[PDB]
């Protein structure tokens, strides 16, 4: 249908007025920063003396995983809690190991006949 179209039509909707700016959206900024993050990281830690291999180019999915690694990890990090809670009862059992002990074996007699 849009073959004999030429241009993309003049201005419309003059009287009502629409189109507030909507100037910024977050993930677009994330993508823009993503396209340069690896190279800027490489260079600015290069002046610090720490070494890294060449910034191999990354694909879009690779870029998104990179972004999640640099952003999702920062916003989502709750590793320590359940581990120590689970270790709590193991330690409690470790104290509880007394259980009156005693009896046992390889412990009998006093004879010196060898």
What does this structure look like?
It is classed as structural protein. With 114 residues, the chain is mainly alpha-helical. It has a domain at 26-96. 46% of the residues lie in helices and 0% in strands. The chain is built from 3 helices and no strands. The chain has helices at residues 26-46, 60-75, 82-96. Helix 1 crosses helix 2 (60-75). It is elongated. The protein starts with 25 loop residues before the first helix and ends in an 18-residue tail after the last helix.
Which terms would index this structure?
monomer, 114 residues, mainly alpha
| Helix share bin | 40-55%
The profile of the biggest β sheet is: none
Envelope shape: elongated
Q: End-to-end span in angstroms?
A: 109 Å
Question: Topology as H/E string?
Answer: HHH
Strand content: under 5%
Secondary-structure class? mainly alpha
**Number of separate strands:** 0
**Computed CA radius of gyration, to the nearest angstrom:** 34 Å
Supply the number of helical segments: 3
Summarize the helices and strands and which ones pair or pack:
Blueprint: H1 26-46, H2 60-75, H3 82-96
Short overview:
With 114 residues, the protein is mostly helical. It has 3 helices and no strands. It is 46% helix and 0% strand.
